[model samples]
Structures are given as C-alpha cells and as structure tokens.
Target: KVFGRCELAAAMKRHGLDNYRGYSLGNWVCAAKFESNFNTQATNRNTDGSTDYGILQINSRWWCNDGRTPGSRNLCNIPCSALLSSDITASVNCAKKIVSDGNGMNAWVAWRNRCKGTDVQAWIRGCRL
Candidate 1:
C-alpha cells in the first residue's frame, strides 16, 4: 500500500516512532519518502549485497532474513517478507530495532543525504499528528 504523507505520519505516531531515536516524525516521513516513497513493498539492492525492504527500507542482510542475501544474520528474527506487508507494524518494529541496535537513522543513507539538516518538519506540516 502507498501512504499519503500524513497517513505515514499517523502510522509513525501510533507506534510512537517519533523521538525514539532522537528523530522527529518529520524525519521519519522524510526518510520514507526518499527510501520507498511510502510504498510498503519497496525494495532496493545495495552494493554490499543487502536488499532494503519496505518503506523504511530495512536491510535483509542485517535485520530480516529474506533467504537470499549471502551471510544474512536475521538479527530482527523476522522474515523479510514481513517488512513488505501493508500492516507496517513489522516495518515499524524493525526500524525501531534498527536504531535501538545503536546504528541510528544513518543506517539508511537516504536519510543521511536527503533528510538530515533540512527543514524536515515541513514534511509533516499538513499532518494533524
């Protein structure tokens, strides 16, 4: 499922994803935009041989087991398929785990390159959350 800007924000808000890792809801919204454009099934193959999954683009190699990437560790203890589901709960939980694992949002360079140091709050301007 593709989410509208506020729709995505609402999801994050519901899960208390904001400020969990010193990131605003807007920063989460901003990362999702650049990572997957809010598409639940988004996937990208990285140069290091990891596949990014879902709107937050959780990695298959380190976080989820996709039965594809070589030497994947499955640290999140979830199948990568869960990351692609529309429920987004798995995605949120895993993304939270990603940062809580002490990697932080810089785990996704899209956030580092595009969402960092900008007016990220504008990404949530119209969202009531």
Candidate 2:
C-alpha cells in the first residue's frame, strides 16, 4: 500500500522537510500509518483545514462524486481535495500543501507556542494525537 515511500522521501527532501523541526518524522509517518495504513484510498476527519466531506479527509461531502468517476468540480471552494487522485497519496500531498500554503508548519508552531509555551512543544503537540 505504501508503495511510494521513496517518492515521498524525495519530495520531502526537495521541500527541505527531510527533518522535522519539533517532531520526529516517525511521528508524522506513524499518524499517516494509522490513518490510512499506507493505503492510498484512505480518508479521515480533518482538524487543520477546510469544511468538506470526502476521502483524504475531505470536509465538503458534496465535493466528492458518486456516480462513477468524481472530479474536483464536486468540491465547493478550493481544489484541495481535487489535488490527489488516490486517497492516501492525496492526503499526504494535501498535508504538504497545507504546510507550504502560506500557513505552513509555522502556524502549528505558533499555536503550540501559545498553548504549550515553547516552539518545540507546539510542534510536537500539533502533530501528536
């Protein structure tokens, strides 16, 4: 199912995300591991972004298609869910996009700092379950 670790690693490396600032890569991998079990067809509830209902943890249910093949048009606002064709892969990519899209991990860091009192504490808390 996780037939893309190499690809993922490469992308992370390119984005300078090879090493997690406040949390271990394992922490993130572990979350993804449980969420989809490395399955690309996995979907769950999103606590960080959006309001849709669909796979890859999409919040807007209407964004997903039901007939036979679904497209991004099903989503209401942004094309977030539309980015990934596979479920698990999409979720991971979505996570990356979330970080890169203005907010990035910095937002999580700020949140953690405000709640935990330290940058590292915030980062770890934001990712951990």
Candidate 3:
C-alpha cells in the first residue's frame, strides 16, 4: 500500500508512534518519508547481501529473517515477508525494538540525515494529530 503522508501519520499515531519511547510522531513521520516514502512494500538491497524490508525498511541482516541473508540474527523474530503487508503492525513493532536497543531512531541513516532534531512539522502538516 502506498500511503499519503497524512494517511501514514494517522495510521502510525494509532499504533503509538506518537512520542513512543521519547521520539515524537513527527520524527517518525519524517523518517518514514525518507526511508520508504510510506510504501508498505518498499525494499532496498545492500551490497553486503542483506536487504531492507517494508515501510520502515527493517533490515534482513538483523531485524528480520529473510533467509537470503546468511546467519542473520533475526532479533525482531519476524519474517521479512511479513513486514511487506499494508497493516504496518509488524513494521512498527520491529521499529519499536530498534528504538529499545538504545539507538532509537538513529538506526536509519535516512532519519539521521533527514529528520534528526528538525522541527518535522512539514512532514505531518496535513495530519490532525
């Protein structure tokens, strides 16, 4: 599913990304905008044989068990394919795990470069939340 920016915000807010573990919804909104453009099926393969999956682009080398990535830890304990669905619960939950690891939103370079410490209102300007 390709979500409009505000649509993604509304969906993520319902899942508690709003100020989740100290990161604001705007931060998440900004990250999602840069990571996968709110497309549920988005993917990016790395040069190291790992691939990123889903809207938040959880990686196969650690967070997801893609099988193609040799000796992946699968720390999120989820299949990579599961993250590709429209419902975003899997993606959001795995992202929560990423945040819990102490890196928070810095797990994605996209967030670091495009979202970190920015006002981020422009990312969710049309949303009600």
Candidate 4:
C-alpha cells in the first residue's frame, strides 16, 4: 500500500508500534522511508541470493518464503506474499516478532546504517499523530 507520511504514522500508532522497543514513531517512519518508501509490495533482491519483502523489507532467508525459493527459515511462518498486502496486519505482526527475536531495530540495516542516532524529528514533522 502506498501511504502518505501522516497516514503511515497514524497506522503505525494504531498498530501499537509508535513506541515499540524504545524506538519512537519517527524512527520507524524514517526507516520505512529508506527501506521501501511505504510501498507494501516492495521487494529487493540482495547479493546474497536473499530478497527483502514489504514495507519493512523483512528478508526471505530468515523471515519468510517466496515459495519459489527453497531454503527459507520462515521464522515468521508467513509467506513473503503476505507481507505485500494493503492490509498491514500480517506484516506488522511479523515485524514485531522479528524485532523481539533479533536485536530490535538492528534487524533492519536501514535503521542501523541510516536512521540510528539521527535526529528523526523531521520524519514525522507536520504529521498529526
């Protein structure tokens, strides 16, 4: 799903992710902007023969299965396709699981490499959350 910045913020708040694991809503918004630009159907094939799926770019190697791929750990126990939906419930649930199971936001390289420690206030500026 393509969401406006404010819309995404509101959705994140509704999903109880505005302040998950000590990460603010702005942090998530910034990570999502860099990760997939809020496109739910976004996918990226990494050099390691794994693909990232959905707005959070959860990886198939450990989080989900593309069905065509054979070596998925499927830790989220969800199909990669399920993450690419307009309704974000499935993706949000899986993302929570990933964060809890991994190193919080460290699971997303975008968060670690870019959004981490950065002043993320601008990411939520003008959004009435």
Candidate 5:
C-alpha cells in the first residue's frame, strides 16, 4: 500500500502539506483520495494526449515528462516515473510550486472538480492530528 488515509494525513502534516501556504489540508487529502486513492503508481491517460501521474495525478502537459511524450513543458523538471515512486517528496514539492503559481489548489483538477466547495474535513477525520 502507498499509505493509509490516516498515515498519509500524518505524513502530509509533517511534510508541511497540511494547510500548506494557506491552502486547505483537507482539500489536499481529499483531492489525493479522489485522484489516485493515495497510490503513488497511479496513472491516467487524458483525452488531450497527456497523462496524469502519481497521487495528485499531476498532468504531463506542464508538470512532468514521460520521455516518450512530445511537447511537455516539464516545469517541475522531473521525469514522470519519479512521481510514480513511493516517496512523495518530489510530488509534494512540485505540487507546492503549482499551488504557488496558480490560484492555490485550484491548479488540481481533482481539487477543483471534486474536493472544492465540499466538506473535506472527513479526509482527515481519524488522523488524530
């Protein structure tokens, strides 16, 4: 398993992703849950000929490069495979930059489409933190 919800919450908190940079921690957790079920190896092909990678489902259009894919901006400067690793440090770091660049977590489609404007507290309900 990548991480259980409670463990992931605790780890996210320790990694400064919990309410990070004024964004909502619950939103982050909820987005990840809906995006990838917290699975690091998650990948989804998009109709735009791009693929979303990892727990956050970071898009290949601007965030990462799969090498085989052409025209990726790769703003995060990381290979798509890196995001699929169990260690989420790179993913979280890139996510932070994305949030800073955009209107906070609105950069994440999962967050905008799913976690946004909802009661997200349940994502961390039993985390005990």
Candidate 6:
C-alpha cells in the first residue's frame, strides 16, 4: 500500500524519472486500482503465511531492505524514507523507472498481461488521467 503510492513515487522522483519524460498519472492510478485498491497500508498473507506489504504488495524482505526498521515495516525502520513516504504518483513513478531501467517494456508487458485476463483490463485501458 505505502509502497504503491508512497515509496515508489519518491524513488522515481528522486531518480529524476518523469522529471523530463512525464510519466503517466493514469498509469499509476490504474495500477493502484488493480494492485491495491489505493490502500496505502495494505498487507496480505498467503495460505502458507508469508507476508506481502504495501500498495504494490512488495515483498517485505526486498523493499524492506533499504528503508525498513528492525521490528515492523515502518519507513523509519528503513533508510530510504525519502522513497517511502505516502505519495502515490511518486511511488508509481519510482516503480516505473525501476521497470524502465531494469527491463524495458517488461513492466508494461507484465501489467498489460495481467490486465489482459479479465474485465479489469477495460478499467485499466479506459483510465484517463
């Protein structure tokens, strides 16, 4: 939850992503609808009991590495609060950059792929600003 609208946005902005190219606000909001219902603090558990956290459902261990605290998933727990604060567009922008930098088009492809499966795709594609 926090990861979707907050952490990811900050990270992206910090990296100058969309600072020039202008990443899509619609894209971020669309992803929020599908991924986390815009829930900034959402978390879930699999039947096996592993935990997923935040809007993007980022694995606590992965994102939690740099900006997390010792006990819980608080931003102060981590060292990258600049990237973890509650700001939606910023977080989405950050994830987009991570996607663009790590693997061009894979992020979009993955998102489109997921949206490809059901009516939610319509919502995603139809999202406008």
Candidate with the greatest TM-score versus the true structure: 3
For all predicted structures, in order, the TM-scores are: 0.95, 0.37, 0.96, 0.93, 0.92, 0.44
Per-residue alpha-carbon lDDT of model 4 for 1-129, expressed as tens digits? 798888998898799888887788999888889999999989999887889988899998898988755677998898899999988887889888888875899888999999999998788899887
Error of 3 at 115 (Å): 0.7
Off by over 4 Å in 3: none
Give the whole-model CA lDDT for all candidates, comma-separated.
0.90, 0.40, 0.90, 0.88, 0.86, 0.44
Name the weakest run of 10 consecutive residues (lDDT summed) in model 2.
Answer: 120-129
In terms of TM-score, how similar is model 2 to the real structure?
Answer: 0.37
Better of 2 and 3 by TM-score: 3
CA displacement after TM-score superposition, residue 21 of candidate 2 (Å) = 4.7
Error of 3 at 85 (Å): 0.2
State the lDDT of candidate 1 residue by residue for 33-121, as single tens digits. Answer: 99999999998898988899998898887899988898999988999999999998998988888888776888889999999899999
lDDT for predicted candidate 1 compared with the true structure: 0.90
TM-score of 4: 0.93
Index of the highest-lDDT prediction: 3
Clashes of each: 0, 11, 0, 0, 0, 15
Instruction: Give the CA lDDT, 0 to 100, for residue 72 in model 3.
Output: 92
With a 3 Å backbone cut-off (N, CA, C), the pairs that clash in candidate 3 are none
Please, what are the lDDT tens digits per residue for candidate 5 over residues 1-129? 477998888777877897787866788899889899989999999987899999889988998889756788999999988999888888898898888885888888778898888999888887777
Candidate 2 lDDT, 1-129, residue by residue in tens: 343444443443344444544434433433333344444444444454334322224333334443323333443344544533443444444455544546444433323333333332222333322
Prediction RMSDs, each to the true structure: 1.1, 8.7, 0.9, 1.2, 1.3, 7.4
TM-score of 6: 0.44
lDDT of 2 at 115: 31
Preferred candidate (lDDT higher): 1 or 6: 1
Off by over 4 Å in 1: none
